Ligand binder design. Sequence first.
Ligand SMILES: *[C@H]1O[C@H](CO)[C@H](O)[C@H](O)[C@H]1NC(C)=O
Length: 7
Amino acid sequence: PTTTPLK
Ligand SMILES: *[C@H]1O[C@H](CO)[C@H](O)[C@H](O)[C@H]1NC(C)=O
């Protein structure tokens, strides 16, 4: 249910 500084 989250994310991260992807490309
Ligand atoms: C966001 O960065 C995190 C660092 O722990 C992970 O590498 C995660 O897979 C990244 N999200 C995406 C969509 O690449």
